[PDB]
Amino acid sequence: AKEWLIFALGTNNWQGPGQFAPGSGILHQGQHIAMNSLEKCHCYSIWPSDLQKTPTDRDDYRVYEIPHPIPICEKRWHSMTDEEVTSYCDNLLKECTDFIEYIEKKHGKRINLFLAHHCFMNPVIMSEINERRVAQGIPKVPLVVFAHGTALKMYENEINKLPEFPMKYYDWIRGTKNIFESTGHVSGVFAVSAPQKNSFEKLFPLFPQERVAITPCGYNQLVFHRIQGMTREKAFGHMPQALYDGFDATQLSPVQRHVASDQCIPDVNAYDRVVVFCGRFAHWKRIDSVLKAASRWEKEDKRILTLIFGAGSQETRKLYVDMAYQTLGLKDTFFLGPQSQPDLANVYTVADVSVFPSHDEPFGLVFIECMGCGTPVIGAKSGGPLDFVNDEVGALVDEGTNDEVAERVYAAVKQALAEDWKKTKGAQCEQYALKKFSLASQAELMLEFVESHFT
Ligand SMILES: O=c1ccn([C@@H]2O[C@H](COP(=O)(O)OP(=O)(O)O[C@H]3O[C@H](CO)[C@@H](O)[C@H](O)[C@H]3O)[C@@H](O)[C@H]2O)c(=O)[nH]1
Ligand SMILES: [Ca+2]
Ligand SMILES: [Ca+2]
């Protein structure tokens, strides 16, 4: 058996006390846990944060501690001075090489896999680290990149001459750094979705297409599984409503009066059924389709409680909250903000069905997590859900306008509740997620693929 000693350079913070993570940070964290699960495999990770700190009680990860928010492709990279970019990158490279030295000394073994998130500075840094090694007569270590899509969109914006994307990185990464111009620097790319594989190949046409594959994505079954004895009061009854700053609670109708900043949902046990959404408040998630669906079913006085989890900017929180309460007249729908993964597992455990009606969801971890807890799922016929949602575990509604998708979600929820998909499909959902998408199984497949294709 091959012994793996892996070093993984992440772009985003992990989810921890005091700071939620974006989906690409969740994915890195999960991959870390997964690879460390495997016999004969250690994985060591570094990632940036302005809020979280390197732990002093454990050695498996470090934090690149920075005094400003993490730079994003689309605080933008383009907004930084060339000096700031250089120092950010130089300092990160230095912290990477110090960690690598620690690992190699501790194990008496060289690292034999470099993982880098996104198609920008992380592969640049790791490629440079390899150059310095080969210059001392040490073998380069294979470098595998995770294409999440944001660096790719930034390059496309640069090429398309969008405001705020004056051309700076794409030409450099091709013509100076040559990162994806052969396999001399990068051994393989995993993309989260087919659209990202397509986009990568167009931008980097000298990279072998056969070395770009779809990332085998997994969920954390240790957290997301059916939580025995969970109740609605335990799961979400102590969760304060999260609206937006300056929300005016006087502008509510009599039946809306339970909606209030920082207050729990009263009498959760009184509702008949529980419908859940979870996702960041990006327009393509179509939270408004969920709200419009509830606008219809709340009139029918089946007491359906709808719970909106996830984070957004103040502007986007204001868009959906006002849409809920002012435009749509909702009264049994509540915003609970972002929540920890174990909190979400409790919620999914007691939910009747979850609705995630995204347009072109890249993969859809939320789906797998929810199914992992024994709960059926409703999506739209687009993106990654097309591959894994089937009749045994939920439903995908036909694509269309936000309004059409809303009506179709309404019909699908009505079906789910009428037919009791929680009861008839729930066991299926959990068995299917576990079998197909558990973290460790996926990481085993991922490393097999690395060994056969990228080494
Ligand atoms: O309140 C929240 C919301 C989300 N999550 C976690 O974050 C994940 C992703 O949530 P989402 O809102 O979909 O984030 P995105 O950043 O949009 O996710 C991207 O990244 C994921 C991981 O690669 C892919 O599965 C998605 O399809 C892709 O959109 C969830 O599954 C959870 O694990 C939480 O822990 N708490
Ligand atoms: Ca060795
Ligand atoms: Ca990318």
Coordinates of C-alpha atoms and ligand atoms in Angstrom, one line a residue:
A1 CA 0.0 0.0 0.0
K2 CA 1.2 3.5 -0.9
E3 CA 1.8 5.7 2.1
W4 CA 0.5 9.2 1.4
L5 CA 1.9 12.3 3.1
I6 CA -0.2 15.2 1.8
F7 CA 0.0 19.0 2.2
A8 CA -3.1 21.0 1.2
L9 CA -3.2 24.7 0.6
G10 CA -6.7 26.2 1.0
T11 CA -8.0 29.5 -0.2
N12 CA -10.8 30.1 2.3
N13 CA -11.1 29.8 6.1
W14 CA -12.5 26.6 7.6
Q15 CA -15.7 26.8 9.6
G16 CA -14.9 27.3 13.3
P17 CA -15.9 29.2 16.5
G18 CA -16.5 32.8 15.3
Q19 CA -16.4 32.3 11.5
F20 CA -18.5 30.5 8.9
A21 CA -16.9 29.1 5.8
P22 CA -17.8 29.4 2.1
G23 CA -18.6 26.1 0.3
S24 CA -15.0 25.8 -1.0
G25 CA -13.7 26.1 2.6
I26 CA -16.2 23.5 3.7
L27 CA -14.9 21.2 0.9
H28 CA -11.2 21.6 1.9
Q29 CA -12.0 21.0 5.5
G30 CA -13.9 17.8 4.6
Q31 CA -11.2 16.6 2.4
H32 CA -8.7 17.1 5.2
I33 CA -10.8 15.0 7.6
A34 CA -11.5 12.4 4.9
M35 CA -7.9 11.9 3.9
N36 CA -6.7 11.7 7.5
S37 CA -9.4 9.0 8.0
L38 CA -7.6 6.7 5.5
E39 CA -5.1 4.0 6.5
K40 CA -1.5 5.0 5.6
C41 CA -2.6 8.6 4.9
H42 CA -1.8 11.9 6.7
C43 CA -3.0 15.2 5.4
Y44 CA -1.7 18.6 6.7
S45 CA -3.5 21.8 5.8
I46 CA -3.0 25.5 5.8
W47 CA -5.7 28.2 5.1
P48 CA -6.1 32.0 5.8
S49 CA -8.1 33.8 8.3
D50 CA -8.4 37.3 9.7
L51 CA -10.3 36.0 12.7
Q52 CA -9.2 32.4 13.6
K53 CA -5.8 31.5 15.0
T54 CA -3.4 28.6 14.5
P55 CA -4.1 26.0 17.3
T56 CA -1.4 25.3 19.9
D57 CA -2.7 21.9 21.0
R58 CA -2.7 20.1 17.6
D59 CA -0.4 19.9 14.6
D60 CA -2.6 18.8 11.6
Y61 CA -3.4 22.3 10.4
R62 CA -2.2 25.9 10.6
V63 CA -3.8 29.2 10.0
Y64 CA -2.3 31.8 7.7
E65 CA -3.2 34.7 10.0
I66 CA -3.8 38.0 8.1
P67 CA -4.9 41.4 9.3
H68 CA -7.5 41.9 6.6
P69 CA -10.3 39.8 5.1
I70 CA -9.3 37.0 2.8
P71 CA -8.7 38.2 -0.8
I72 CA -11.3 37.0 -3.2
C73 CA -11.2 36.6 -7.0
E74 CA -14.7 37.9 -7.6
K75 CA -11.6 42.5 -0.7
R76 CA -10.8 41.7 -4.4
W77 CA -7.3 40.7 -5.6
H78 CA -7.7 43.4 -8.2
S79 CA -8.2 46.1 -5.5
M80 CA -4.8 45.3 -3.9
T81 CA -1.5 46.9 -4.9
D82 CA 1.1 44.8 -6.6
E83 CA 3.2 45.2 -3.4
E84 CA 0.3 44.0 -1.1
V85 CA -0.2 41.0 -3.4
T86 CA 3.5 40.2 -3.4
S87 CA 3.7 40.4 0.4
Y88 CA 0.5 38.3 0.9
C89 CA 1.9 35.6 -1.4
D90 CA 5.5 35.8 -0.1
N91 CA 4.4 35.4 3.6
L92 CA 2.1 32.5 2.7
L93 CA 4.8 30.7 0.8
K94 CA 7.1 31.1 3.8
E95 CA 4.5 29.7 6.2
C96 CA 3.9 26.8 3.8
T97 CA 7.6 26.0 3.6
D98 CA 8.0 26.2 7.4
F99 CA 5.0 23.8 7.8
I100 CA 6.4 21.4 5.1
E101 CA 9.8 21.3 7.0
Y102 CA 8.0 20.5 10.2
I103 CA 6.0 17.7 8.6
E104 CA 9.0 16.2 6.8
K105 CA 11.1 16.2 9.9
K106 CA 8.3 14.8 12.1
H107 CA 7.6 11.9 9.6
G108 CA 11.2 11.3 8.3
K109 CA 9.5 11.2 5.0
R110 CA 9.0 13.7 2.2
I111 CA 5.6 15.0 1.3
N112 CA 4.4 13.2 -1.9
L113 CA 1.2 15.1 -2.7
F114 CA 0.6 18.8 -2.9
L115 CA -3.1 19.9 -3.0
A116 CA -3.9 23.5 -4.0
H117 CA -7.3 25.1 -4.0
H118 CA -8.4 27.3 -6.9
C119 CA -6.6 28.1 -10.2
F120 CA -4.7 31.2 -9.0
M121 CA -2.1 32.0 -6.3
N122 CA -2.2 28.6 -4.5
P123 CA -0.8 26.6 -7.5
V124 CA 1.6 29.5 -8.1
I125 CA 2.9 29.2 -4.6
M126 CA 3.1 25.4 -4.6
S127 CA 4.8 25.4 -8.1
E128 CA 7.4 27.8 -6.7
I129 CA 7.9 25.6 -3.7
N130 CA 8.6 22.6 -6.1
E131 CA 11.0 24.7 -8.2
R132 CA 13.1 25.4 -5.0
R133 CA 13.1 21.7 -4.2
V134 CA 14.1 20.4 -7.6
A135 CA 16.9 23.0 -7.5
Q136 CA 18.3 21.2 -4.5
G137 CA 18.1 17.8 -6.3
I138 CA 14.9 16.7 -4.6
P139 CA 12.1 15.2 -6.7
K140 CA 9.2 17.5 -7.5
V141 CA 6.0 16.4 -5.7
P142 CA 2.9 16.0 -7.8
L143 CA 0.6 19.0 -7.6
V144 CA -3.2 18.6 -7.9
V145 CA -5.4 21.6 -8.2
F146 CA -9.0 22.0 -7.1
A147 CA -10.9 24.2 -9.6
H148 CA -13.9 25.7 -7.8
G149 CA -14.7 28.3 -10.4
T150 CA -14.0 31.7 -8.9
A151 CA -10.4 32.1 -10.3
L152 CA -11.7 30.9 -13.6
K153 CA -14.5 33.5 -13.6
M154 CA -12.0 36.2 -12.6
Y155 CA -9.8 35.2 -15.6
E156 CA -12.9 35.3 -17.9
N157 CA -13.8 38.8 -16.5
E158 CA -10.2 39.9 -17.2
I159 CA -10.3 38.6 -20.8
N160 CA -13.8 40.2 -21.2
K161 CA -12.5 43.5 -19.9
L162 CA -15.1 43.9 -17.2
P163 CA -14.8 47.0 -14.8
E164 CA -12.9 46.0 -11.7
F165 CA -11.0 43.3 -13.7
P166 CA -8.3 45.2 -15.5
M167 CA -6.1 42.4 -17.1
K168 CA -3.4 41.4 -14.5
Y169 CA -3.5 37.7 -13.7
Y170 CA -4.7 35.6 -16.6
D171 CA -1.9 36.7 -19.0
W172 CA 0.8 36.4 -16.3
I173 CA -0.3 32.9 -15.2
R174 CA -0.1 31.7 -18.8
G175 CA 2.9 33.6 -20.2
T176 CA 5.2 34.2 -17.2
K177 CA 4.3 31.4 -14.7
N178 CA 3.2 28.8 -17.3
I179 CA 1.2 27.1 -14.5
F180 CA -1.3 25.2 -16.8
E181 CA 0.8 25.3 -20.0
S182 CA 2.0 21.7 -19.8
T183 CA 2.1 19.2 -16.9
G184 CA 5.5 20.6 -15.8
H185 CA 4.1 22.5 -12.8
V186 CA 0.6 20.9 -12.3
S187 CA 0.0 17.2 -12.5
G188 CA -3.8 17.3 -12.5
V189 CA -7.0 19.3 -12.0
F190 CA -10.2 18.3 -10.2
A191 CA -13.1 20.5 -11.1
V192 CA -16.3 20.5 -8.9
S193 CA -18.6 20.6 -11.9
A194 CA -18.7 19.9 -15.7
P195 CA -19.1 23.7 -16.4
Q196 CA -15.9 24.3 -14.5
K197 CA -14.1 21.6 -16.4
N198 CA -15.3 23.2 -19.7
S199 CA -14.3 26.7 -18.5
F200 CA -10.9 25.5 -17.3
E201 CA -10.1 23.8 -20.7
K202 CA -11.0 26.9 -22.7
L203 CA -8.8 29.2 -20.6
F204 CA -5.9 26.7 -20.4
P205 CA -6.0 24.9 -23.8
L206 CA -2.4 23.5 -23.5
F207 CA -3.4 21.6 -20.3
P208 CA -4.2 18.0 -21.2
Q209 CA -8.0 17.5 -21.1
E210 CA -7.5 14.0 -19.9
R211 CA -5.9 15.4 -16.7
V212 CA -9.0 17.4 -15.8
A213 CA -11.5 15.3 -14.0
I214 CA -14.7 15.9 -11.9
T215 CA -13.9 16.1 -8.1
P216 CA -15.4 13.1 -6.3
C217 CA -17.3 15.1 -3.6
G218 CA -18.4 13.8 -0.2
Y219 CA -20.4 14.8 2.9
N220 CA -19.5 14.4 6.6
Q221 CA -21.7 11.5 7.6
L222 CA -20.3 11.7 11.2
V223 CA -22.1 15.0 11.6
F224 CA -24.9 14.5 9.1
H225 CA -26.9 11.4 10.1
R226 CA -30.2 10.8 11.7
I227 CA -29.9 12.3 15.2
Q228 CA -31.6 9.9 17.6
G229 CA -34.2 11.4 19.9
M230 CA -33.9 14.9 18.3
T231 CA -37.0 17.2 18.7
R232 CA -38.0 20.5 17.0
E233 CA -37.5 22.4 20.3
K234 CA -33.9 21.1 20.6
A235 CA -33.1 21.4 17.0
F236 CA -34.2 24.9 16.2
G237 CA -36.4 26.1 19.1
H238 CA -33.5 28.1 20.7
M239 CA -32.3 29.6 17.4
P240 CA -32.9 33.4 17.3
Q241 CA -34.3 34.9 14.2
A242 CA -31.7 36.6 12.0
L243 CA -33.1 39.4 9.8
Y244 CA -31.1 42.5 9.0
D245 CA -29.8 45.5 10.9
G246 CA -32.6 48.2 11.2
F247 CA -35.4 45.7 10.5
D248 CA -38.6 47.4 11.6
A249 CA -40.7 44.9 13.5
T250 CA -43.6 47.4 13.7
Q251 CA -44.3 46.8 10.0
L252 CA -46.0 43.4 10.5
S253 CA -49.5 42.2 10.4
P254 CA -51.3 40.5 13.3
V255 CA -50.5 37.0 12.0
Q256 CA -46.9 38.1 11.3
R257 CA -46.3 39.2 14.9
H258 CA -44.0 36.3 15.8
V259 CA -41.3 37.6 13.4
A260 CA -38.7 39.6 15.4
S261 CA -35.0 40.3 15.4
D262 CA -33.1 38.0 17.8
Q263 CA -36.2 36.1 19.0
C264 CA -36.9 32.4 18.8
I265 CA -39.8 31.0 16.9
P266 CA -42.6 30.5 19.4
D267 CA -44.5 27.2 19.9
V268 CA -42.6 25.1 17.3
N269 CA -44.6 22.0 18.3
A270 CA -47.8 23.6 17.0
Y271 CA -46.8 23.4 13.3
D272 CA -48.0 20.4 11.3
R273 CA -44.9 20.0 9.0
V274 CA -41.4 21.5 8.6
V275 CA -39.9 22.6 5.3
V276 CA -36.2 23.6 5.2
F277 CA -34.0 25.7 2.9
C278 CA -30.2 26.1 3.5
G279 CA -27.8 28.1 1.3
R280 CA -26.0 31.4 0.9
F281 CA -28.2 34.2 -0.3
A282 CA -26.9 34.3 -3.9
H283 CA -29.5 35.1 -6.5
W284 CA -29.0 31.7 -8.3
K285 CA -30.1 29.8 -5.2
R286 CA -33.6 31.2 -5.9
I287 CA -34.6 31.7 -2.3
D288 CA -37.4 33.8 -3.8
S289 CA -38.8 30.6 -5.4
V290 CA -39.0 29.1 -1.9
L291 CA -40.7 32.2 -0.5
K292 CA -43.2 32.4 -3.4
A293 CA -44.0 28.7 -2.9
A294 CA -44.7 29.3 0.8
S295 CA -46.9 32.3 -0.2
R296 CA -49.2 29.8 -1.8
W297 CA -49.2 27.1 0.8
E298 CA -49.6 29.4 3.8
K299 CA -53.1 30.3 2.6
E300 CA -54.2 26.7 3.0
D301 CA -53.9 26.6 6.8
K302 CA -52.1 23.4 6.8
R303 CA -49.6 24.8 9.3
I304 CA -46.3 24.4 7.4
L305 CA -43.3 25.9 9.1
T306 CA -40.6 27.1 6.6
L307 CA -37.1 27.7 7.9
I308 CA -34.5 29.7 5.8
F309 CA -30.9 29.0 6.8
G310 CA -27.8 30.6 5.5
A311 CA -25.9 33.9 5.4
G312 CA -26.1 37.0 3.2
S313 CA -25.0 40.6 3.0
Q314 CA -27.2 43.1 4.7
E315 CA -28.5 44.2 1.2
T316 CA -29.4 40.6 0.2
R317 CA -30.9 39.8 3.6
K318 CA -33.0 42.9 3.3
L319 CA -34.1 41.8 -0.2
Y320 CA -35.5 38.4 0.9
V321 CA -36.8 39.4 4.3
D322 CA -38.8 42.3 2.9
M323 CA -39.9 40.0 0.1
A324 CA -41.1 37.5 2.7
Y325 CA -43.0 39.9 5.0
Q326 CA -43.9 42.9 2.9
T327 CA -44.4 41.6 -0.6
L328 CA -45.5 38.0 0.0
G329 CA -47.3 38.3 3.4
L330 CA -45.5 35.3 4.9
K331 CA -46.2 34.4 8.5
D332 CA -45.0 30.8 9.1
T333 CA -41.6 31.3 7.4
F334 CA -38.6 32.4 9.5
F335 CA -34.9 33.4 8.8
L336 CA -32.5 31.7 11.3
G337 CA -29.2 32.8 9.6
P338 CA -26.1 30.6 9.1
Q339 CA -25.8 27.6 11.4
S340 CA -23.1 25.1 12.4
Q341 CA -23.1 21.8 10.6
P342 CA -24.2 19.8 13.7
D343 CA -27.1 22.3 14.2
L344 CA -28.2 21.7 10.6
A345 CA -28.0 17.9 11.1
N346 CA -30.4 18.3 14.0
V347 CA -32.7 20.4 11.9
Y348 CA -32.7 18.0 8.9
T349 CA -33.4 15.2 11.3
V350 CA -36.7 16.8 12.2
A351 CA -37.6 18.3 8.8
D352 CA -40.3 16.8 6.5
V353 CA -38.5 17.8 3.3
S354 CA -35.8 20.3 2.2
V355 CA -36.0 22.6 -0.8
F356 CA -33.0 23.9 -2.6
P357 CA -34.3 25.1 -6.0
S358 CA -30.9 26.4 -7.3
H359 CA -30.3 27.3 -10.9
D360 CA -27.2 25.3 -12.0
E361 CA -26.1 24.2 -8.5
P362 CA -22.4 23.2 -9.1
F363 CA -22.6 20.0 -7.0
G364 CA -25.1 20.5 -4.1
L365 CA -23.5 19.4 -0.8
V366 CA -26.7 20.6 1.0
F367 CA -28.7 17.9 -0.8
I368 CA -26.3 15.1 0.3
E369 CA -26.1 16.3 3.8
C370 CA -29.9 16.5 4.1
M371 CA -30.4 13.0 2.6
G372 CA -27.7 11.8 4.9
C373 CA -29.9 12.7 7.9
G374 CA -32.9 10.7 6.4
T375 CA -34.7 13.6 4.8
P376 CA -35.9 13.9 1.2
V377 CA -34.9 16.7 -1.1
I378 CA -36.5 18.9 -3.7
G379 CA -34.3 20.7 -6.4
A380 CA -34.5 21.9 -9.9
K381 CA -33.5 20.0 -13.1
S382 CA -30.1 21.7 -13.5
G383 CA -26.5 21.4 -12.3
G384 CA -25.1 18.6 -10.1
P385 CA -28.5 17.5 -8.6
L386 CA -29.4 16.1 -12.0
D387 CA -26.8 13.3 -11.3
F388 CA -27.9 12.2 -7.8
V389 CA -31.5 13.2 -7.2
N390 CA -34.0 10.5 -8.3
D391 CA -37.6 9.4 -7.3
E392 CA -36.4 7.3 -4.4
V393 CA -34.9 10.3 -2.6
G394 CA -36.9 13.3 -3.6
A395 CA -37.7 15.3 -6.8
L396 CA -36.3 17.8 -9.3
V397 CA -38.7 20.4 -10.7
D398 CA -38.6 21.5 -14.3
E399 CA -36.4 24.5 -15.0
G400 CA -38.1 27.9 -15.9
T401 CA -38.6 31.4 -14.5
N402 CA -38.4 32.0 -10.8
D403 CA -42.2 32.1 -10.7
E404 CA -42.6 28.8 -12.6
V405 CA -40.0 27.1 -10.3
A406 CA -42.0 28.5 -7.3
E407 CA -45.3 27.0 -8.5
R408 CA -43.5 23.7 -9.2
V409 CA -41.8 23.7 -5.8
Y410 CA -45.2 24.3 -4.2
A411 CA -46.6 21.3 -6.0
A412 CA -43.6 19.1 -5.1
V413 CA -43.8 20.1 -1.4
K414 CA -47.6 19.4 -1.4
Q415 CA -46.8 15.9 -2.8
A416 CA -44.0 15.3 -0.2
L417 CA -46.3 16.2 2.6
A418 CA -49.4 14.4 1.3
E419 CA -47.5 11.2 0.5
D420 CA -45.2 11.6 3.5
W421 CA -41.9 11.3 1.7
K422 CA -40.1 11.6 5.1
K423 CA -41.6 8.3 6.1
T424 CA -41.6 6.4 2.7
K425 CA -38.3 7.7 1.4
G426 CA -36.3 8.7 4.5
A427 CA -34.5 5.3 5.1
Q428 CA -33.7 5.3 1.3
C429 CA -32.2 8.8 1.5
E430 CA -29.8 8.0 4.4
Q431 CA -28.7 4.6 2.9
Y432 CA -28.1 6.2 -0.5
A433 CA -26.1 9.2 0.8
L434 CA -24.0 6.9 3.0
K435 CA -23.3 4.4 0.3
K436 CA -22.4 6.9 -2.5
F437 CA -21.0 10.1 -0.9
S438 CA -19.4 9.4 2.5
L439 CA -16.2 11.5 2.9
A440 CA -13.7 8.6 3.4
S441 CA -15.0 6.5 0.5
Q442 CA -14.8 9.6 -1.8
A443 CA -11.3 10.5 -0.7
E444 CA -10.2 6.8 -1.3
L445 CA -11.5 7.1 -4.8
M446 CA -9.9 10.5 -5.2
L447 CA -6.4 9.2 -4.2
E448 CA -6.8 6.1 -6.4
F449 CA -7.5 8.5 -9.3
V450 CA -4.5 10.7 -8.4
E451 CA -2.2 7.6 -8.4
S452 CA -3.5 6.3 -11.7
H453 CA -3.8 9.6 -13.6
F454 CA -1.7 12.3 -12.2
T455 CA 1.5 10.7 -10.6
Ligands
LIG1 O1 -25.6 28.0 7.3 C1 -24.9 27.3 6.7 C2 -24.8 27.2 5.2 C3 -24.0 26.3 4.7 N1 -23.2 25.5 5.4 C4 -22.2 24.6 4.8 O2 -21.8 25.1 3.6 C5 -22.2 24.1 2.6 C6 -22.4 24.7 1.2 O3 -23.5 25.6 1.3 P1 -23.9 26.6 0.1 O4 -24.7 27.7 0.6 O5 -24.3 25.7 -1.0 O6 -22.5 27.2 -0.4 P2 -21.7 27.4 -1.8 O7 -20.5 28.2 -1.4 O8 -22.7 28.0 -2.8 O9 -21.3 25.9 -2.2 C7 -20.5 25.7 -3.3 O10 -19.5 24.7 -2.8 C8 -20.0 23.5 -2.5 C9 -18.8 22.6 -2.0 O11 -17.9 22.4 -3.1 C10 -20.8 22.9 -3.6 O12 -21.4 21.7 -3.2 C11 -21.9 23.8 -4.1 O13 -22.7 23.2 -5.1 C12 -21.3 25.1 -4.4 O14 -22.3 26.1 -4.7 C13 -23.3 23.3 3.1 O15 -23.6 22.1 2.5 C14 -22.9 23.2 4.6 O16 -21.9 22.1 4.7 C15 -23.1 25.5 6.8 O17 -22.4 24.8 7.5 N2 -24.0 26.4 7.3
CA2 CA 10.7 9.8 1.7
CA3 CA -10.9 28.2 -9.6

